[PDB]
Every structure is written in C-alpha cells, then in structure tokens.
From a paper:
To assess the accessibility of TNC, we constructed and purified mutant variants of SgfSL by replacing the amino acids, His165 or Ile170, to either Phe or Ala. One of the proposed T3 tunnels is blocked by the Ile170. We assumed that Ile170 is rather indirectly involved in the coordination of Cu3α ion within the TNC. Indeed, the detailed comparative analysis of the structures of the wild type SgfSL and its two mutant forms showed that Ile170 can affect (via hydrophobic interactions) the position and mobility of the His157, belonging to the 1st coordination sphere of the Cu3α. In our laccase structures, the Cu3α-Cu3β distance in the TNC varied by more than 1 Å, from 3.96 ± 0.10 ± 0.11 Å in the Ile170Phe to 5.24 ± 0.04 ± 0.08 Å in the wild type (the average value for monomers in an asymmetric unit with standard deviation and estimated maximum coordinate error). In case of the Ile170Phe replacement, the imidazole ring of His157 can be more strongly fixed than it is required for the enzyme functioning. Both replacements of Ile170, inhibit the reduction of oxygen to water, within the TNC and catalytic activity of SgfSL is decreased.
Laccases (benzenediol:oxygen oxidoreductases) are copper-containing enzymes that catalyze the oxidation of diverse compounds by molecular oxygen. The active center of laccases contains four copper ions: A blue (Cu1) mononuclear copper center (T1) and a trinuclear copper cluster (T2/T3); the latter consists of the mononuclear T2 copper ion (Cu2) and two T3 copper ions (Cu3α and Cu3β). T1 acts as a center for the reception of electrons from the reducing substrate, while the TNC serves as a binding site for the molecular oxygen and its reduction to water. Three-domain (3D) laccases are monomers consisting of three cupredoxin-type domains. two-domain (2D) laccases consist of two domains and exist as homotrimer, with the T2/T3 located at the interface of domain 2 and domain 1 of neighboring molecules, and T1 located near the surface of domain 2.
Residue numbers in the entry:
A (entry chain B), B (entry chain A): 40 to 317
C (entry chain C): 41 to 317
Write the structure that this text describes.
Amino acid sequence: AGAAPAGGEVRRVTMYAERLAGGQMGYGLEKGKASIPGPLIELNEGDTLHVEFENTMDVPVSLHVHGLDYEISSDGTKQNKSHVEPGGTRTYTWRTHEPGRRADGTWRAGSAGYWHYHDHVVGTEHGTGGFRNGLYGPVIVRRKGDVLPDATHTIVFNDMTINNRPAHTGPNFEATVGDRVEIVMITHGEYYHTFHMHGHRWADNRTGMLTGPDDPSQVIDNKICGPADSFGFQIIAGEGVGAGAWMYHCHVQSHSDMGMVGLFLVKKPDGTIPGYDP
Amino acid sequence: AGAAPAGGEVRRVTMYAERLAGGQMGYGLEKGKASIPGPLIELNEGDTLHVEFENTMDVPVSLHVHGLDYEISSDGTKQNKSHVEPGGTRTYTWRTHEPGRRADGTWRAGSAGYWHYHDHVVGTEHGTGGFRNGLYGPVIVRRKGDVLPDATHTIVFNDMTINNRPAHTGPNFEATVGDRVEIVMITHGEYYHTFHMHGHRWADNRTGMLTGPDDPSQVIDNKICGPADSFGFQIIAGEGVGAGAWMYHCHVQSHSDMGMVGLFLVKKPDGTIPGYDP
Amino acid sequence: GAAPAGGEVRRVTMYAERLAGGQMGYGLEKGKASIPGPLIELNEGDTLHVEFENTMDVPVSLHVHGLDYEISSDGTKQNKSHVEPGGTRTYTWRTHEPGRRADGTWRAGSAGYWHYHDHVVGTEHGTGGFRNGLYGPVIVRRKGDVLPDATHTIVFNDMTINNRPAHTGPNFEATVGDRVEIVMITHGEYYHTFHMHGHRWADNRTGMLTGPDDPSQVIDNKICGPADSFGFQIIAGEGVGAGAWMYHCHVQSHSDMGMVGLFLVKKPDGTIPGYDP
Ligand SMILES: [Cu+2]
Ligand SMILES: [Cu+2]
Ligand SMILES: [Cu+2]
Ligand SMILES: [Cu+2]
Ligand SMILES: [Cu+2]
Ligand SMILES: [Cu+2]
Ligand SMILES: [Cu+2]
Ligand SMILES: [Cu+2]
Ligand SMILES: [Cu+2]
Ligand SMILES: [Cu+2]
Ligand SMILES: [Cu+2]
Ligand SMILES: [Cu+2]
C-alpha cells in the first residue's frame, strides 16, 4: 500500500456551513454540497491549511479543530470572538508539526492522529445544537511513512445515532476481501458508547496497527468512547475470517437493540456476499 | 508454572447451554455443570477450537466470540443464520493466528489477548436477554512465552452485578502471598464501570505486565470499562503490601454502595488472613 | 530540573477539617484545609508517614491509590483503619523503583499520577467524603523525570470541578513556553471526557512521549470515570501562542452546565490577546 509523504505543503480550501434537509446543518467544500459528517480533511505532518470559511446560515456558527495547531484567533469560539456571524466569512488557519527533539532534551509529539472539527457556537457556547444538526467532520493527519488505505470510512456516534441517520439505517460500508480499509471513529454528544466490530480487530495505539513485534499495545475489537473522543485504524477486510456481512454496533445493549447498528459488507472478488440478503 | 508454548494444536470441546435457577442460563462443558460465568477457554496462538455445541433449552441460543478468527457461519447470530434452535446442535470453530509480517511489510496483529464469548440471540438479536441471564464467559489466548499464572479468576461486571451474584456477595478470591494471580475482567450490559483493586496495580497493556524498562504503558489500579470491554492482568498477590482482605470494587460511588464489592483474600503461608474477622 | 533517586523517609502532618457549607477537606497545616487536598509528591523509593488528625465530629479515613501500604493503612472500616472523631493515626505509604524479579519478570514501579481520598464518610466507600471534598493528588516521580515549572490539579467531582460553583473555573495561568503539569482526577457517579483547546498529550504514564519508538495515542480528549487518575506535562502555548485556552468536559450537557475553565497563557509582556470576561 502507498506511503504518506513528508508534509510541508501550504494548502488552501473553501468550506461552507449550510442548512440541509430536515433542520440539519453540515459543512461542505463547495456551496450546495454540505454533508454529514463533513468532508474528510487529510493532511501530512507539517502541512498548513487555510480554510476560507463561509457561513450561509441565519445563525452564528464556527469551525473548531481538535489536535491540530491553531492560534487563538482560529479557536472558533464566541468567547474569543472567533465565530462567524450570519452570512459572514472568516479564514481559519490550522498548522501541523512533525515530531522532534526540543532544546530541553524532551520529545515534542507530532500532530499525527485521527482528529475532527466541529461547531462551537450553535445552540450553546459549546455547539450542542451544532452536533445535533450535524456540524462535525473528520480530520486525518498522517505521519511520513504511514500506510495508506484503499478506502477511508467515518463512523460517528452522535448521541443515539450513527451519522445523524435514523435508527436501523446503517450506514453500511463495502469492501472486497483483502482491501486495506480505514475506519475513522468519532463520538459526540451526551452518552458513552462502546464501538465493536465483528470478525476484525485493531491495536489501541495511534494508527490502529502494531508498529512491530515490540509494540505492547492491547489489541481490541471493542473500545469505550465518550463525547469528542476520536480514534481510527486500518484493517485488512476479512483477513483470516473471509467474506460476509460483518456486523458492527455499539455494544451498549439498549443502544444496539434500538438500532445503533450497521454492516461491513465484505465481498468476494466476484462481488457476492456469503450469507446475505441484498 | 512456566511460559506459554508455541501453538497450532487442533482442539475439540463439548459445550451446552442450560437453564439455571432463578430464570438464569449458563454455559458448561458437561450437562448439569453450566456456570456463570461460563468455563474458561484457554488457547495458544494458532490453535483451532471446534465447539460441539448443544442447546438444552426451550428457546433459541447462540455462541459468539470476540477477538478470535471465525467465518460467517460461526458468527452465532440470527442475522447470518448461525444460532442454535431449541434442542439443536452446532459445531462452532474458532481459530487463532500468530503475529507476523505481511507481504506488504506491515505487521499483522496476532490473536493473543483476554477475550470472551456470549450469546447473540436470547431476548433480542443482540445478547441482551442472554447477558442478563448469564450466557457469557472468558477466553484467554496466550502468545509463546507469555508468563503462566498460578490461578485465574474471572470478574464480570454485568449490569449492576458481579457475575450475576446478589449485592455484597462478592465473589471473593483467595491466594497466598507470592501467588501469581491472573484476573480476567469483562463488562456487559448497559452501564459503564471503573474496576479498582486495593493494594495492587497492573500495566495498561495486552498482558497487564510491563515488558521491561522501556514499556511506557500507564501503571494503573482503576480502569474505566463499558459493555463488552475485556482486559486482564497478572499480579503478585500481596507484593509490597502483605496479606489481608484486599477490597476490589467498582468505583462508581453508588455502584459500590449497592453491591458491586468483593474481597481478594491474600493469605499468609500458614493460611491465615491477618485482621480478617468475618 | 529532573527528579532524583528516592530513598528518603518523609513525615508530614495532615488534618481532616470541616469547611463552609457542609464541606470537608484535607490540610497540611491546621485551619488550612483545601479542596482539592494538598499536593503530595514523592520519589520512587521514599516512604511517607502521615501523622493524621480528624478534627471533625464524624469518622474519617485516608486511603491512597497506586502506592504500597500494608493493610493497616488501608483506611477502611473493614480493616478498622479509619480515624475516630478527634483522633489521630499514622498512615504509612511506601513506594518502590521498577526492577527485575527473581522469576525474570519486570516489576512495575510506583511512579505515576495518583490520589488519596476518604473511605468511610457517609458510606463504607466514602460516598459522603467525595461529596464534601476529601480528595487530593499524589504524584510519584521516577528518577530522571522532567520537573514542571508548575502543577495544577483538576478534579471532576460529579458535575463540579474541584467542588466549585458552576462556571467558576478554576482558571490557571502560565507564560508561553512554561512547563505546566496537569493532574486530572474524576470522582462521583458520572463519566466525563476531559479536553483542552490548543494542547495535546500522550496517553502514557508521564503524558509525554519517551521517544520516537513510543506508540501511545497522542490525544486532547480523554474519557475517564470515578477514581480515574492521570497526568501530563505540556509546553504552555507550544506551536499555538498566547490566549485564553478553554478546558472543559466535553459531555455536551456538562460543558453547558458549567464544567469549563481557562488555561490563561500570557505573552512574556503579560498580555493575553482577545481575552475578556
Ligand atoms: Cu452506544
Ligand atoms: Cu462480536
Ligand atoms: Cu455483536
Ligand atoms: Cu471539541
Ligand atoms: Cu459500576
Ligand atoms: Cu482504593
Ligand atoms: Cu459482543
Ligand atoms: Cu476503595
Ligand atoms: Cu463531564
Ligand atoms: Cu476543542
Ligand atoms: Cu471546546
Ligand atoms: Cu479509591
């Protein structure tokens, strides 16, 4: 699989917050193309990204990012007056840095991680109304040398939903046996959850893959997550287990009973899924 | 005594689902010997376990595992038609694999860990009723040269009970000062908990033990866990602290007040527990 | 600086005292009780004898996490190691360095971010002690650990921070570049997720990566439950500059209801751009 290059590029993007169907709100890279979750932002460690942000709505909104570097003027908080007025525009700047050695001899960790952005002013001073409506999205920051996936999928547990979807509507995600699939798992809102995958597992470290044979990270298929937690991993689809409709769910019993469920549809090369009704 | 060997043996076992008193249900290795939690299944990485499984109950049941490799047909789900009908039989196969380097140069995570099995059919299409009833049990998969303990105890925080026991009935576990004790700690149901042990601590990694002086893992005595979380560790009973009645409990305050307490009884070599006057 | 090897025997005096409005707290000097309790810092190898006085009219105890204590310093009713009202008792905490056992395994040492609390007030799990403020931090350093310019303790106790009224911080200030140690402890009934704008840390013992081979997750958001304890050291304003950097629980209803504070990081000229209450 491909390998992430060393960062250092200054990139520039427009992003738009727009109302969607049913009182929903989302970000998009171009006007009329807001989505929930918002578009995935992929950065190589050392990149800078300038986000020419526009709020097309009738209420204040913001863009705030976890993990990445930002001056206070890019917080996306009302307390700092770095939110965006109705119809307004503002340029947010996120930077990243590589790991390295400080002067005090100590080690400065790098920006690599599975991170996210969201709104910080819709509803409350903490964006409670924004998460509900869907103002959240993933950011991946890659380290030089990181393995690249064949497909990246974001699953957000926002209160009692997956991706603001109604219960028992997924979403489902498709791969072929052997595909290197990347999952981005963010939790928002009020409730704790446990993310669980049938038939697959990952390491509980930065990349979800053991570094080598001296990596002591626990290997799990089940992880407790809370509001604003984010992690990610990469799995070889159906490795050791074969093709099939592999179920993923929250393992909080009433949460999986009420529809916090989806399917990881792993197809054989020819396209059919063993033991599945399409 | 000693260390885990290399794996790869094909094993077979018989397993039954039976009713127990009080509307409870359990797994056992022989009829009339079901237990809550179910029997401890131990495997070495590479072993294959065929579970000749009989449902001696009048309602459907299934057998589902975390962490191990299994195909779709051994899912143990109503979904891909692998539950066991009342009075029916099924052979579930579980497989494990050693760590290795993939063709693409990535490091494939092995099966070794503290895992668990449970039903996916009683009550709801998830394990809900089965969990409340007691249909759950531990699986340990050891890697070559993992340190082997003198005794293994399973503690399941299932909803607001420890192993479906009444409030304030533990259970209690005995060891002698110096014993190498292994704890398997599983959680199920609806609530998060925080498992805590008095006078002992473990490392937050696969084994619960620091590999050596370069393992950076947290050293902890308190750990948040949610439904279907599982971890385990080994400790030396009494090490640096001496014999006595060492409390373990969930540390959610109302949880310990309403039953979620037990005792780790560490005896002196003469068998007495100092200061423990029941 | 860096922490030295341990070995020393330490003696300290502690009091459980009542506070205004039905609160309780621990103090090192009599009449100086506080919530959170005083910071206790040890080096691996050290022993601490805490001569302890209950200045109150109901029983109290002193229980610790992570450290080594024999049963007689358990601080529980079960082991009859609580302190009578008006009474005194010496609790002994021991620590140890890591080393290799006779059986060749590696014994993990005592170093870490730990805490002490009450275990008898209200119930035999100190539910009433936690409600009133009887908890505090304990830090145990490994030899060679990097020492901060400052340490601040943040206890999520139910839906309060350090038993404070909602929306009352606390705030903590530093100057850009300073080495700031946060101790973070949760108690009560609720899970929380502790988060900091502008800063991140490693999920390991020290909070910092040991080097380029450390695979720990680097995070700015950490779920935690009652009696969870952890710590980290950040460089104030590193890569992001001065400002009023919020920290808050991220469970949405807990941030909205007051579980919010400021990490006030100033420029060397003392200014904090954009900050105004
Ligand atoms: Cu859930
Ligand atoms: Cu499963
Ligand atoms: Cu399942
Ligand atoms: Cu946030
Ligand atoms: Cu509990
Ligand atoms: Cu304790
Ligand atoms: Cu499960
Ligand atoms: Cu306790
Ligand atoms: Cu909270
Ligand atoms: Cu934030
Ligand atoms: Cu925030
Ligand atoms: Cu405690």
